[PDB]
């Protein structure tokens, strides 16, 4: 009961930012936080709902040649810059994105996620 994701339409491809590693009961799940100018930033508040696209799952191979699931979640480019300079803002958006994907596709993702520091994106582009 904190903040929430708001799904907007988007194609796609946008541009990668960073990659989050988590899992379901079945296997590994990767959340690719991407960004695009064509996606609205959060509305200026008078007194947080984050607009973001929730991409369809696409299977990719992990480092061991095993299939895993990856989701592309795109956010506003300017809002993304603000995310890069804010650990609080970034981690919140992660949680928000994860719960957005859980809602849309009926998944149970691991809250205890891990940040990929070398890999910016799981898949192609």
């Amino acid at each position: 009961a904190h903040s929430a994701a708001l799904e907007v339409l988007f194609q796609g491809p946008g541009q990668p930012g960073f990659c989050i590693k988590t899992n379901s009961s079945e296997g590994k799940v990767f959340i690719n936080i991407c960004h695009s100018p064509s996606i609205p930033p959060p509305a200026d508040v008078t007194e947080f709902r984050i607009p973001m696209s929730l991409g369809e799952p696409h299977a990719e191979l992990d480092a061991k040649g095993q299939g895993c699931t990856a989701y592309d979640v795109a956010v506003n480019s300017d809002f993304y810059r603000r995310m890069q300079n804010s650990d609080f803002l970034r981690e919140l958006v992660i949680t928000i994105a994860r719960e957005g994907l859980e809602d849309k596709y009926n998944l149970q993702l691991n809250p205890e996620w891990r940040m990929m520091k070398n890999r910016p994106f799981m898949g192609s582009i």
């Binding site: 590693k21 992990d62 990929m116 070398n118 890999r119």
Partner: peptide, 11 residues
């Protein structure tokens, strides 16, 4: 210590 999948791949 790295994650098993934490390696740079030029998308």
């Amino acid at each position: 210590a790295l994650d098993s999948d934490d390696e740079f791949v030029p998308y």
